[PDB]
Design an enzyme around this catalytic site. Structure first.
Site, PDB file in Angstrom:
ATOM      1  N   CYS A 194      14.809   4.574  -0.155  1.00  0.00           N
ATOM      2  CA  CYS A 194      16.093   4.850  -0.788  1.00  0.00           C
ATOM      3  C   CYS A 194      16.434   3.750  -1.791  1.00  0.00           C
ATOM      4  O   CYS A 194      16.835   4.031  -2.919  1.00  0.00           O
ATOM      5  CB  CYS A 194      17.198   4.971   0.264  1.00  0.00           C
TER       6      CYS A 194
ATOM      7  N   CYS B  53      16.962   2.336   4.792  1.00  0.00           N
ATOM      8  CA  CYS B  53      15.877   3.099   4.183  1.00  0.00           C
ATOM      9  C   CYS B  53      15.302   2.376   2.964  1.00  0.00           C
ATOM     10  O   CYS B  53      15.954   2.296   1.926  1.00  0.00           O
ATOM     11  CB  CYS B  53      16.385   4.493   3.792  1.00  0.00           C
TER      12      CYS B  53
END
Length: 110
Positions: A38, A35
């Site tokens: 993230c 991700c």
């Protein structure tokens, strides 16, 4: 002075429910290594973990490594932050967010 926990801590099946049970205020970051958003917010979470050291425990729950726990809260996109008060989820933030918005989110629930 110095605090016991002043940075994000890894959560998994061995300490997730216990951390929620034994800490009044916990922010859990649901994330994964694939991700990009993230990774983009990780430095901000570290800074806030220092800032609210002793008040808020910042936990990291890797969703690849702990799919059952993530599914428990219906994590449908990452990063998702959930604020746990007295072990109960009371607020959430989804997607990458600026530090200012993140901090106000903490202040609103703490």
């Amino acid at each position: 002075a110095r605090k016991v926990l002043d940075s994000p801590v890894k959560l998994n099946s061995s300490n997730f429910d216990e951390t929620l049970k034994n800490n009044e205020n916990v922010v859990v970051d649901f994330w994964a290594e694939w991700c990009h958003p993230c990774k983009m917010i990780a430095p901000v979470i570290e800074e806030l973990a220092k800032e609210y050291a002793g008040k808020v425990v910042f936990g990291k729950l890797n969703t690849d490594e702990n799919p059952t726990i993530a599914a428990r809260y219906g994590i449908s996109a990452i990063p998702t932050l959930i604020f746990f008060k007295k072990g109960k989820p009371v607020d959430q933030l989804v997607g990458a967010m600026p530090k200012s918005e993140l901090k106000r989110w903490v202040q609103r629930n703490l």
